[PDB]
Amino acid sequence: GHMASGPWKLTASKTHIMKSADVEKLADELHMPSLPEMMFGDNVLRIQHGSGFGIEFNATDALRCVNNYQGMLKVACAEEWQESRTEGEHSKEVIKPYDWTYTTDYKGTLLGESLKLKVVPTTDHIDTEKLKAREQIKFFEEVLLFEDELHDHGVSSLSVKIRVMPSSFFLLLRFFLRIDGVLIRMNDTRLYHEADKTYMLREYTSRESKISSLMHVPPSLFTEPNEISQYLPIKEAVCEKLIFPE
């Protein structure tokens, strides 16, 4: 719900999934055939400073990062689940087919009417020695953003959770994708802040592996993101500083 500590205000909304009428409408806006079966459009995890600036994590902004419908599946598929109004577009990026997997490289939504966090590159990494350090967790919360079962072929889910310590907090946004017998993909966004500092660290990693390369691993781990992660090669890794405004 609401958690306060000085100038920081933490907000967590957990409600029912989006209704059909609002799903089709939003899907049309984002130029997608549909949304994940379980679309928690009213859910959020929000971190906000008294100054106004902050960062939040919601399902809608996450879906904006997903490759939308290009009209290529008409060639790739004998029959489609649903059609879609093809997206206007295009960027200078190579056109790739929609894949119904809802893969997203979303890293959170920056908040602020005027004052706002500035995203800058950094050579810093989130120090795991600080993460492994065990102070008492003052506040903990986990929020589900969306989930889909890929027409019973696996799972695609986006969730976010946060640890609040006496003088720091640590957040993990995780996109997890498993296509049964095919592949496992995991996009993690880690957010760290120390009380004294005037910045946050945000470390993004994208991992993925074909299941054929994971056959030495106990199959039970395929349904456990925390355990399977170490077996997945990192294909993209970015670390940025989120500088506090003056």
Partner: peptide, 4 residues
């Protein structure tokens, strides 16, 4: 709960 001390996730990494």
């Amino acid at each position: 709960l001390y996730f990494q």
